[PDB]
What we know:
This is part of a larger assembly, with chains A (377 residues), B (103 residues), C (482 residues), D (166 residues) and E (461 residues).
Chain A (H helix, E strand, L loop, with lengths): L2 H7 L1 H9 L5 H18 L6 H26 L11 H16 L4 H13 L6 H14 L4 H13 L4 H14 L4 H28 L5 H21 L9 H27 L6 H11 L14 H12 L9 H6 L1 H12 L5 H16 L2 H4 L3 H8 L1
Helix pairs in contact in A: 3-4, 4-5, 5-6, 6-7, 8-9, 9-10, 10-11, 11-12, 11-13, 14-17
Chain B lengths: L36 H9 L8 H7 L4 H6 L3 H8 L2 H18 L2
Chain D lengths: L3 E6 L2 E7 L11 H4 L12 E7 L4 H13 L4 H10 L12 E2 L6 H7 L5 E2 L2 H13 L12 H17 L5
Parallel strand pairs in D: 4-5
Antiparallel strand pairs in D: 1-2, 2-3
The structure holds one RNA strand of 43 nucleotides.
Function (chain A): Component of the SSU processome, a pre-ribosomal particle required for the maturation of the 18S rRNA from the 35S pre-rRNA precursor.
Pfam families (chain A): HAT_PRP39_N, U3_assoc_6
GO biological process, one term (chain A): endonucleolytic cleavage in ITS1 to separate SSU-rRNA from 5.8S rRNA and LSU-rRNA from tricistronic rRNA transcript (SSU-rRNA, 5.8S rRNA, LSU-rRNA)
Amino acid sequence: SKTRYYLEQCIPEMDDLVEKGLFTKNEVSLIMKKRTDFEHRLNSRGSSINDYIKYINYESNVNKLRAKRCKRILQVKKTNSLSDWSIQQRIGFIYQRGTNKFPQDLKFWAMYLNYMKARGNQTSYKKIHNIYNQLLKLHPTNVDIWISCAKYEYEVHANFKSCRNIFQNGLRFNPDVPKLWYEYVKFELNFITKLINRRKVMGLINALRGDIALTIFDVCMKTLGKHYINKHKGYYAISDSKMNIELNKETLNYLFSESLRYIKLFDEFLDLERDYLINHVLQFWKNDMYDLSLRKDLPELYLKTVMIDITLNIRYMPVEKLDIDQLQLSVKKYFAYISKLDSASVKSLKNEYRSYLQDNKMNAEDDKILDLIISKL
Amino acid sequence: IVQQNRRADHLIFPLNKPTEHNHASAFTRTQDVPQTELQEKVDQVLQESNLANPEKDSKFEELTPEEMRKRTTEMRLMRELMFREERKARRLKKIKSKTYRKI
Amino acid sequence: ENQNKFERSQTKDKKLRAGLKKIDEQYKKAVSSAAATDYLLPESNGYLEPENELEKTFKVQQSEIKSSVDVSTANKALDLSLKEFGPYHIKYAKNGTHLLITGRKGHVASMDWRKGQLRAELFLNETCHSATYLQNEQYFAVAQKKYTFIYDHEGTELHRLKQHIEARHLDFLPYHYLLVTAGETGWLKYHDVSTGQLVSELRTKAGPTMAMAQNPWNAVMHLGHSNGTVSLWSPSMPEPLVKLLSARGPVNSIAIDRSGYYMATTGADRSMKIWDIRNFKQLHSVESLPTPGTNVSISDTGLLALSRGPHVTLWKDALKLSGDSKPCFGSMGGNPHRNTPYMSHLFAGNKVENLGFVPFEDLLGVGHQTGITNLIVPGAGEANYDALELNPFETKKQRQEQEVRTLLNKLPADTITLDPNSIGSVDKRSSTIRLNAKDLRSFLRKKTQNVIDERKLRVQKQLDKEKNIRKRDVIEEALSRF
Amino acid sequence: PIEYLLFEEPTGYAVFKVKLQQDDIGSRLKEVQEQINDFGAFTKLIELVSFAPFKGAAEALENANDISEGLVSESLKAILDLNLPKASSKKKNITLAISDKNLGPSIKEEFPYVDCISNELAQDLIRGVRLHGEKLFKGLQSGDLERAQLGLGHAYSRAKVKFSVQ
Amino acid sequence: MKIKTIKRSADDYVPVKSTQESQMPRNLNPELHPFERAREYTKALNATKLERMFAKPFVGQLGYGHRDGVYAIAKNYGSLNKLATGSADGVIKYWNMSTREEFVSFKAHYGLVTGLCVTQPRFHDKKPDLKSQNFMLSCSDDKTVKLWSINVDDYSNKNNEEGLIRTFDGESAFQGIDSHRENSTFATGGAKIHLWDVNRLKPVSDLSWGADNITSLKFNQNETDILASTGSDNSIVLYDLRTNSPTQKIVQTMRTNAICWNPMEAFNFVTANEDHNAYYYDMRNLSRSLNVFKDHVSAVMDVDFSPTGDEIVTGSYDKSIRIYKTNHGHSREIYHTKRMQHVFQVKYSMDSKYIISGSDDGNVRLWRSKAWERSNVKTTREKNKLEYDEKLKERFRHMPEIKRISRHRHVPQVIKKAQEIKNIELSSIKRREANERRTRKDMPYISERKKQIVGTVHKYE
RNA sequence: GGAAACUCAAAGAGUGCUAUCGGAGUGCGCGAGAGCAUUUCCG
């Protein structure tokens, strides 16, 4: 057998564990017969990850009990012997064996990764890189793997070159999820904000705009459009004019539903040239794709683009007198678009009136003005 | 070398240093050229303004009353916004300094 | 700490010095890494301790030990009391699973006992002396009236034996698949139960065999005659391999420890002897026992048991080399340097017929007139069996696997000397300094052959004469050289 | 020298590390070429180390067309760039047991440090992994192979015929 | 009073479910395992009987063989399954031994082919394209040494220059070659030994002692710049290309046919000559043949070391091949078949398990070296059983009955009768030597390891 | 004579089941360790 071999390999830790008096022979034979039964259950014919989990629970609890009897009997923390790292070495062996014998359960993979991230003070990040790279190899599709240990590599070690490297590798591996693109934009903005805060810390002790996020936004837009189209039309390129045009309208709808989420959790981020990259988004959504949709379908979408382009300024201030001061720009563009629209003019009027109602003295008189007087007086 | 080759007890025949290379991790770009169009565009943006540890060491080569309690948020901000290679070199240099001043 | 149990009992050439250092270092490392297994041994043995001075260990009987013992062992403590056939007799199997009982009238029953699975009962109408299993539940031999029979596992009479003119002492040598018979005529014969061949017919020449035991460690057979001679035999030499003078008169019982080191022997002159075997030293005698103990057996831990007919007396740790562990019968004068009976049981009026320790549990089976009784004894069973040879949790598949493996590893019958470590040596022609040759018309054909033979004889004589030649007063001094 | 193997499957691309090696000189013997048939010895010889499924149906058809003309594509190049180590020039260059000599030069053109190989050893190793099929993949998928290959076959046939569906 | 009794408890011994495996509890006591030595002895005897039951050494032919018996075989050294055979009517062939077929054939010369070897020949005006085509070169007795490419599908990197890359031509004939495995140099033998490299049509150097022909050569396997040769002055010569000169010369009692270096010692070689024993020399003290393998009946036509560095394959002029170990000096075991005659070239393969023998009937047969170890990858308990009972046979090989089972073969009747009469002749001549030594006084105890040397230039240092 | 297989035993075939000192530093090897080994922070 090999169960005899694993049990015989775990004997010197109990040897010095009885040689130092913190475990007598009766209870160490008790834990050894319990580990014998657990290990045969582990190396059965058709075992289970539940068996791996509860054997790991047994080893962690006997490690906690060994530390407790060490701080109670010998009154020292580290016994500088074989008795200390042996249980963590065995837990590492059990997690490696479980990830070899059962590689499809991310609950067990995540328990291994959390245990190793906790024991990073004793065994450093090379084992983290090894088991995470083999996890990436065995599951390239599941984007939460890339997102999780990119968060690890950014929040525990903060190595931005390798972080952007694994985001670009995962984005090459599956450029048809929205979540990976959007959280790559989120990480890229976190890096650019930390860099500008480094520059501000330099200025405190006394070029690099959002073009990275805008280029990956553009590649996000065209690639998610193409792969949404290929998620539809499964095997045969559907060939009739109205069906092709209506599916182009459908992917325009889904793509703009992604772009508005970009605008949402960028407006939550802003702290930067926010109007610059928001106007880059809206210049792209002025220069449309497959249909040039301003006079074509989705006129409510065209109204929402006009509404964002008008209300670009108003979304930032609690001191609304500055909004009234610069509102000549907003109402000037508003008149420039009311002069172009007719019933979308009416819906845009209701939208701008609701925005000013959500908003609410010399400028409130001179530079609607009824609400400006009602908020000034 | 043939004499101690006939005193050893078991001879495992990969004798010389064999091909033992670590696998291509996802953290390291292999052939050091942009493959995809995204790598193309991001590197043709980041050709100009990158913190390739020079500005990191220049802006992190700073860190007493400030050591005790006066800069209790400024030192936290500096050690937080320190990057990876700058933080590793700072840890090694401070550990060597404490090894010199505390033996 | 335990390496005495696991122990197995200056040169010129440099490579041979290094090789000798490698092999005795490997010996030391393998003995240590074998001795470090009893940490992983599954359970611990049992004991009853006095824990006081008034609480003697032999004022404890079956009622209180069966009260404070486990339910499974208490239900193992059987009593298969049968009365319509005669004074019964026990033989457990090699592993502790099956039991084989034998009445002196006609009864032979081979049966599980921890399960109620009577798998071969057979009555007969002739006096069945003793019985024993062969290798398994499958085949069991009974020493009947005047022909030994062997039987299949359900009860079909497999074989009468044409030899074994009678039989009253019969058992098995397990690894060799040997059946050993000693009878009331002066014989001892070996019959292999695999090939079916007889192996040897050793004429005993010492009267009828009064008792017999088997050594497990080297598979020699220990006869005990009416001369008081304990002889040890094996089918190499037709003579007895050694002899011993154990008791005076006849010896009624003899029993060997499973490690082959110790021999208990009880005669008919109210005498017991304890013997070493590997040194043949009479270790200590025991006199003054009231009746001649008819049957002694010995546990797997050193806990021997006399059986004096009504009494059964178990002594713990009465096989050391000291003069303290001499088994006595009563603490007199305030003497804690004796060895009292570790425990004892007294049956009513029925003479105990034979003992036998259950192999891997804590109980001593004893068979008497009215049947069977097992006795719960805490230290008298080896706790931790080794599953590659004996196994009380068999199945059909692994039982057949052990059958085919042991039939493939049948040791040949010549290989049982007095010491079975002696098949690796050189053959008594050692030459520790080895001389390796470096440091020293049909009448007419017959007549010419005789001529060439006589010339070879003359050349041999001349070479030996030359070898002996190479390896070897005044007036007569003047009158020399003539 | 066969230490990585590439298998293509109608749910996704698989790459197998070759743990130990096959007997090269006796590779026509009965007692060697029954080991490919039985399962208890093939997983001694080949383990799964990467399996990336193309998930789009049309992207599966496009990968199948690019393989069927013998050309690299995005997902294949992606998983080889991930899995294949940079064997540095001091040691060797890495080897890769692919199924066809038409595909061979098109990966040697793109990756320099790889070296494709298809002798009869790669042929019957790929034959063994094709025979054992799903039982190698140990559950890293959602969907069996035969219905997916039925759909992919019908699509590849219609894309070859350019059959008018009007 | 405190009592206790052992508790089987029936759960840590028999399982809870059905599918999990039952316990094998374990006690390593020499009490409970009584007969140690007799039981492992009987396991050794069953090991010997099962080895004789599985002693099935022959694995196959390859192709339909050549025309008229081989006379040169060259294994390659980089790859495993590629092997060149040159045979008598000028026919060289380059076999892929995996499918056991030939890549290409060539009518290589007119007369007898004499020797071939493969090279990875680094040209200077060309990259070594040695991962798509493989190069072998062959010398015959019609004064030509041809160097050839071979198209080979070992890889699949590319997509044509099939044969006869070039032809070196010599003054006299040629008798053998071998290629220096570094820097594209190769040496030949003929009237006198020559050293070429593949950028010249003329010989770069000439390296004889005197005007005496040279039957065979061999380079090293490491410390490559020295080499050895054998000429029909019954002589072993060594040479060193670093000094570019011959360096020592011994003369034995009969002509050395085939020499072979050791690929793990780098200063030991075996030497196969017409007296029926392969000598095994140490280089830096050529006064004593530090072993002599002494079991044939006829001329020892070829030898080679296995690349594991301890086994010798030999093939005799009588129709038999033998495998020796280095450390013994007698035959481990012997192959033969009825359909092979006069094995002329034997070579270990680089796998160190398969010996390629080439007869004079035409075939290039193959054999397993260990005649019972199969080639499949085995499960770990089976590998444990095989290595354990092989170690038992190795430990108990001196017992007489398993010696008389492990020793005997079916040696063919010709070899058995002729070895029997050779043995009675040797016993008779030893008896007459004992009589003569019984008389005389100045008679040296002549060592068997120095019996065959009858002269050494650079006598002693 | 038909057989309930749920009493049990001995066996025969077919099917499915597994692998082979601790983190750094320090003399170190071609962004880099797979190891040689410590008084350097040490634990």
